[PDB]
């Protein structure tokens, strides 16, 4: 099981996958300050590792800020908005 | 301010390194199944994001048990020893 590098948006955005027993197949990453849409396949559980993610998440039209250790779900086959004020670390789950 | 990509032991760590005002310099990572031993700078403090890092800290001769969400530090100009049975993923802050 290879440790998976990933890069979006020029470098902004970095993860590494994994898959552990307890995390199913994830991801660790940081998104560097920016704005950011992403798609998704799998559905995505979101918990924030450090600093803020403001998200626009799918059926709703406010903005919502997530915070250390907070979590937001994003279903799958969709899509979900980020503003991201300074680097911020995330773990993402694809359910 | 570039996100910096990390790889150690033939790809079985790796690791995004960031600068945030909520975490100084930091980096987030992932250790696959193996045995690892990491000299220190900086002093750092590891949170465990997600399965259980196993570690040998200076000063002591007993292993230790970190598991998601629990912290710990290491020197600087040290060094530190880690069992990991499947992967676990990590905040690092470099203080």
Redesign the interface.
């Known amino acids: 099981?290879?440790?998976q590098?990933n890069?979006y948006f020029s470098?902004?955005?970095?993860?590494?996958g994994?898959?552990?027993?307890?995390?199913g197949r994830?991801s660790?990453?940081?998104m560097?300050e920016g704005e950011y849409t992403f798609g998704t396949a799998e559905p995505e559980e979101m918990?924030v590792?450090?600093?803020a993610l403001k998200v626009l998440l799918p059926g709703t039209v406010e903005w919502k800020v997530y915070t250390?250790?907070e979590v937001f779900n994003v279903p799958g086959h969709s899509e979900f908005h980020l503003q991201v004020a300074?680097?911020?670390?995330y773990?993402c789950r694809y359910l």
């Open positions: 099981s290879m440790l590098s890069e470098g902004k955005v970095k993860s590494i994994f898959t552990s027993s307890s995390t994830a660790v990453g940081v560097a918990t590792v450090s600093g250390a250790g300074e680097p911020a670390s773990l």
